[PDB]
Design a protein around this ligand. Structure first.
Ligand code: NA
Ligand SMILES: [Zn+2]
Length: 648
């Protein structure tokens, strides 16, 4: 199985497996199939939400690209291909992370001639429009750096509604938009609708995304496949979820959306689950309108059971903690996050995706009905598997014994450390009476993540995990110990710009732990940093002493948090967690850049096929992985692209 697909620009395309899909019942596979069809129909929505020109630009380049009769080896065509591949990845013409508009690496004269050489019937022309007129419209949008420069602008002194290229507002100023929703809100409402979540605000009124409204060509298709899924629901709770979601798309009512989210949160038992709707509001500079996304999934039973083994032993880990007894909870309950297996990704989860989903967003629904927080095990596993043999550990790990141990156990003990951090680490320990939870002020997040990390590091090495059948042998933890220390002392510097220091809380907490252990172990050479041929390597000489030092730092940090010791917190962060050595930074960056590893990853989907008999009865559902990036993007643009090119 090849987890890697291709690499271009600053992007690497991966694939993921869908483990145990074939173990589902046929009726379950059929439900997954329909839900995945409902997911794939939404792609055009996101393109249009990200920019009123995006579908025209995508479709124009697609028509040029697939019908090009010229020299495909020439630099202009190769650069146009890279640009189109970035547009597919980013669901528009802006960087999916940085928000800045792409710079075409090809000439306007080249594109003009390629466009004129394409059959006009294949171009996204409005009725009566010519190819020259389409070019006059779109070329400034693509080529002029001053036009629509940022998809989301967060700069002062500017009308962000007018200086953001996303397409949630049209012909309306920022103050008009902020005031529209400031006035709509009702502060007396204990169960408020999510005002403005599902509409374009235009001139002042809302154009709601719904059947018979804006984007209806795609929403009608989503609803069609959801109605199919409704007929094969696993149980009545899940069926009620699907039925209400259909109603939300048919009416556009935000009260229906709240009703759906309540039913969704109550559907906790079903093997299969999904998201399909206007969900997260990061694409709006005002944080009101939500981009469309979908995910279809089923519970990873083995992985969930493993996290439940950790959760059910919360009290054992608490009792045996190295922290002072006065900081220990007498009764602690562990909460396990379920692990899900993603069957397909779409919209703002595709191709750049998440490793966890925590929904719904409405705080009152979360407070009074609950929530679903899950991690996506097969996406995490694909990230991990794709990295094996990529040259990174070959370049940076001190010796072949470590490289082999990490290759064998690194993925397992890494995920176990995460499970310990997330399911028990933050929940462990208590403050003393009268201590302010905010006593550590700006250092609180760094110290709190260090605390959870140390809890996980201290216990991933415990023989208890062998007894509990979570690790296959007592040596495995050394893989996680080595990579944690290598990352925290040295190799995370690849994320720091030249001349800068450590700023982000997790990066700080990792350097804090590693540098502290390094300092305290130095008289015994517990950890060394050694140079060979001018390259630095982290060398770990006594893993047992590292465990004891992790435990000692855990006790000190627990003390700092539970007593509100701001000066102690500040001393640890400022002395260990911030300063970057310039020589080490440059050395690590030069070694890393030679590896040609792309900084951003995204995934292509598998392909599902419905097998039916003569009379249309389903006889099987198969999943296949033999499609690459170009193929899948073109197939989606051909078969799952129901929106008109202009959505006004
Ligand atoms: Na050694
Ligand atoms: Zn955390």
């Amino acid at each position: 199985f090849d987890y890697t697909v291709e690499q271009f620009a600053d992007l690497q395309i991966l694939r993921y497996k869908v483990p145990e899909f074939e173990t589902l019942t046929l009726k379950q596979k059929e439900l997954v199939y329909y839900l995945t069809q409902a997911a794939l129909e939404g792609r055009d929505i996101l393109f249009d939400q990200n920019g009123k020109y995006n579908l025209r630009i995508r479709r124009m380049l697609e028509a040029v690209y697939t019908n090009y009769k010229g020299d495909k080896s020439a630099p202009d065509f190769k650069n146009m291909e890279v640009y189109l591949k970035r547009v597919w990845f980013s669901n528009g013409i802006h960087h999916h992370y940085g928000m800045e508009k792409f710079v075409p690496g090809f000439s306007q004269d080249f594109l003009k001639q390629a466009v004129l050489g394409t059959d006009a019937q294949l171009l996204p022309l409005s009725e009566g429009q010519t190819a020259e007129q389409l070019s006059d419209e779109l070329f400034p949008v693509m080529f002029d750096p001053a036009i629509l420069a940022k998809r989301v602008n967060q700069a002062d002194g500017e009308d962000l509604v007018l200086t953001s290229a996303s397409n949630y507002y049209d012909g309306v100023t920022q103050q008009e938009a902020e005031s529209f929703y400031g006035a709509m809100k009702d502060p007396k409402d204990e169960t408020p609708v999510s005002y403005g979540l599902n509409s374009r605000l235009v001139k002042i009124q809302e154009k709601v995304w719904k059947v018979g409204g804006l984007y209806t060509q795609a929403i009608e298709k989503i609803v069609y496949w959801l109605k199919k899924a409704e007929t094969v629901a696993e149980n009545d709770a899940q069926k009620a979820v699907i039925s209400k979601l259909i109603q939300f798309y048919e009416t556009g009512s935000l009260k229906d959306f709240d009703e759906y989210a309540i039913l969704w949160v109550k559907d906790l038992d079903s093997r299969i689950d999904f998201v399909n709707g206007f969900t997260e509001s990061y694409g709006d500079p005002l944080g009101v309108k939500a981009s469309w996304e979908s995910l279809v999934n089923f519970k990873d039973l083995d992985a969930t059971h493993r996290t439940e083994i950790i959760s059910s032993n919360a009290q054992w880990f608490e009792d045996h903690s190295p922290v002072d007894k006065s900081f220990k909870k007498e009764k602690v309950k562990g909460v396990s996050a379920k692990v899900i297996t993603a069957a397909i990704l779409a919209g703002d989860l595709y191709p750049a995706t998440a490793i966890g989903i925590n929904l719904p967003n409405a705080n009152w629904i979360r407070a009074h009905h609950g929530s679903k927080s899950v991690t996506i095990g097969n996406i995490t596993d694909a990230y991990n598997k794709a990295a094996h043999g990529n040259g990174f550990n070959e370049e940076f790990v001190s010796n072949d014994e470590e490289r082999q141990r990490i290759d064998q156990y690194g993925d397992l003990t890494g995920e176990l450390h995460t499970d310990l951090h997330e399911s028990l680490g933050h929940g462990s320990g208590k403050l003393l009476p009268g201590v302010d939870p905010d006593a550590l002020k700006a250092y609180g997040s760094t110290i709190e993540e260090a605390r959870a990390d140390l809890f996980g590091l201290y216990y991933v090495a415990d023989p208890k995990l062998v007894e509990l059948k979570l690790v296959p042998d007592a040596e495995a933890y050394k893989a996680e110990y080595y990579t944690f220390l290598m990352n925290g002392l040295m190799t995370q510097l690849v994320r720091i710009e030249p001349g800068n220091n450590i700023e982000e809380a997790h990066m700080r907490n990792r350097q804090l732990i590693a540098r502290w252990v390094f300092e305290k172990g130095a008289p015994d050479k517990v950890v060394e940093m050694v140079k060979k041929d001018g390259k630095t390597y982290v060398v770990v000489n006594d893993y047992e002493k590292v465990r004891q030092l992790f435990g000692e730092l855990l006790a000190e940090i627990q003390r700092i948090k539970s007593t509100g010791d701001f000066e102690g917190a500040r001393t640890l962060v400022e002395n260990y967690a911030v300063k970057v050595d310039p020589a080490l930074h440059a050395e690590v960056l030069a070694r890393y850049k030679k590896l040609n590893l792309a900084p951003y990853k995204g995934f292509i989907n598998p392909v599902y096929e419905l097998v039916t008999d003569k009379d249309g009865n389903i006889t099987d559902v198969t999943v296949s992985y033999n499609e690459d990036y170009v193929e899948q993007m073109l197939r989606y643009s051909k078969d799952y692209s129901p929106l008109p090119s202009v959505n006004n």
